[PDB]
Design a protein around this nucleic acid. Sequence first.
DNA 1: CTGCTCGGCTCGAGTGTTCGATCGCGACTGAGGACGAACGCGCCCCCACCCCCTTTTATAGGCGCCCTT
Length: 196
Amino acid sequence: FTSDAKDKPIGCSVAISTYSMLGHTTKRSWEAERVMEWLKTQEWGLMILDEVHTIPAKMFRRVLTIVQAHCKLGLTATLVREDDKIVDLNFLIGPKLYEANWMELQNNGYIAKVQCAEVWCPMSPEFYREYVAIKTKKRILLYTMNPNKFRACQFLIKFHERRNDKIIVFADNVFALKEYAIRLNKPYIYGPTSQG
DNA sequence: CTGCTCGGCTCGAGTGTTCGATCGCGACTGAGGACGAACGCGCCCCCACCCCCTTTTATAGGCGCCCTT
């Protein structure tokens, strides 16, 4: 039940959809409206919700009441957030039945052991000068882009590329991500990035 | 009354989204033109049977050509 592509949602029972579509608050297309009415009318034996940590959000939580289900199972890997809305999950879905032990899984080999590291990059003198001088929040784009760390990520990626290690670079700022990706001629994914 | 503080508001940018536009193809059809296939008519070829060929003696009339007058 996805806007990008659909497979006759009313035709079959087992369905996979998204919080955004089910809890969509604005005008609904005709076909999506028919599908939504069918979903509301029918009763679901199981309601699986992945990444439950986002459920207590307004629109996402509205889906719980929008759809009817006997048991709504919740699955996730990071059940933590700052706002004290995680406690709301206990009643929104139910009590937390289990939490896997990451260290025990690492010992058992079910999960690859990770050598977690934090590379400290000294900020370049000029960049620090403007960063400290300006009280605005251009610092997000500034300290994210400094010669010491730009050289660092490039060098780290080169070292792992010659080591045949698969790299997944991450960056919150789409602007910085695009700049780094164009400078390193790499395939950045972000924002609109067509599904195809 | 003043000072400090708490978790209620708001923020732009980053995402997840979506309904609406533009651009695009494809698909289809009309008339006209063009080409191919099929059938009709005529032709040559092939296959049969039948006639005619010579040689003989008699005949009489007709016909033709050559020779003589």
